[PDB]
Design a protein around this ligand. Sequence first.
Ligand SMILES: C[C@H]1C=C2C=C[C@H](C)[C@H](CC[C@@H](O)C[C@@H](O)CC(=O)O)[C@H]2[C@@H](O)C1
Ligand SMILES: C[C@H]1C=C2C=C[C@H](C)[C@H](CC[C@@H](O)C[C@@H](O)CC(=O)O)[C@H]2[C@@H](O)C1
Length: 424
Amino acid sequence: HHSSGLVPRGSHMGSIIDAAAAAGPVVLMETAFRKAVESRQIPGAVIMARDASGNLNYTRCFGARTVRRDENNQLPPLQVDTPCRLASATKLLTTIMVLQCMERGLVDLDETVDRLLPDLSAMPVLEGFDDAGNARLRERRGKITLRHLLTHTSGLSYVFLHPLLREYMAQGYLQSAEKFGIQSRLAPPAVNDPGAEWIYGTNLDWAGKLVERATGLDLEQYLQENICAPLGITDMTFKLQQRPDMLARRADQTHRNSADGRLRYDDSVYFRADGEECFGGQGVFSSPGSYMKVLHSLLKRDGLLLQPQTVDLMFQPALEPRLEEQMNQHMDASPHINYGGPMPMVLRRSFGLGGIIALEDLDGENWRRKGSLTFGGGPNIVWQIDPKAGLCTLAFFQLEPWNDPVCRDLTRTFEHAIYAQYQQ
Ligand SMILES: C[C@H]1C=C2C=C[C@H](C)[C@H](CC[C@@H](O)C[C@@H](O)CC(=O)O)[C@H]2[C@@H](O)C1
Ligand SMILES: C[C@H]1C=C2C=C[C@H](C)[C@H](CC[C@@H](O)C[C@@H](O)CC(=O)O)[C@H]2[C@@H](O)C1
């Protein structure tokens, strides 16, 4: 029997295997991440989950912030406080900033953008090309409103995404609309009328300009005063190159080679230059920890960023049946883009203010629920907030291209495991 003075413990294989309970979902999931790093499938990742109550506050960091060895021949770790490129995960921040302007009476969401963005209002709609091949433009039908910008229903697209605009760049209309290797998000014309269709575009870059003009502050200052300060965030910024402390610790971008699935250093323009202008659709750097602070505040409805009622509005389906149907047809037919990331590839969705809303449970009682809000950023960053489950989660990588199968699979296992053990 037991040993005098010593805590009773396992003393043979049977009793040690019974004293240590079988591996739960979360433990098994963490093994997958470690194996992915060990086998060089990913450089690293940070995964974070929080509930409203505080009972759940889970942060795990795996692997490295880069594939470039440091001065000591080591690969430095990806940490919860590592400065990372958020890319389109910036869009949530900019959305919150617009809603703050609305709360303070500076703007109305259904107001036309003419007053603050007359430069946008004056922009034409691109409608194919001539029989010869000249650029064919026309005047916009109807007015763009702030709500159209927040829901990507303005008619604006992205140059890399839409065929007409890809041809626009190829024909040379946007050659001088770049700075330090970063293309302007304000130069290109619209590809449809507001209200006509859901189209992913430069809407939040325009929405950012609107904030700057409505407040008389640049977006960086507005961000610091209105998002960072209230949450005690000191490392979230549009202006990475002016923060030598963050520069010393920042992640490098990694790219997966199309040919052999191998990881390589990606010398990304975004890590060497900020751009003079703060682009609200993409330009923020922060750590995973700081981003979670934002998500968690929204989940708590604590009133630090927005009134609880304004946060509730973000989660309400914003599209009328016609656009809702068109958005789902577009997304279901575009698994090569996959805006929804880890979500099932066919799902009934809508768009709120700040992201995609699930209009059905993803897998009954096992995963994200109806009413959950989600979006992401290019380097395989995925965030979601699920008020019914009482959870919000964040899967943070610094790996392009977007929609990497290894990252998506890992992100799914992460979420499934967290929901299995901690959803309520
Ligand atoms: C066909 C459309 C789908 C796309 C899917 C993912 C990316 C965003 C594409 C363009 C971005 C570009 O930087 C990535 C390309 O190098 C992809 C490739 O051709 O290997 C985009 C474009 O190819 C247009
Ligand atoms: C929610 C996600 C939706 C997207 C839709 C189309 C693209 C695949 C986006 C990522 C593009 C990004 O990886 C590459 C761009 O930085 C290239 C460029 O800016 O020209 C993606 C990201 O914006 C996040």
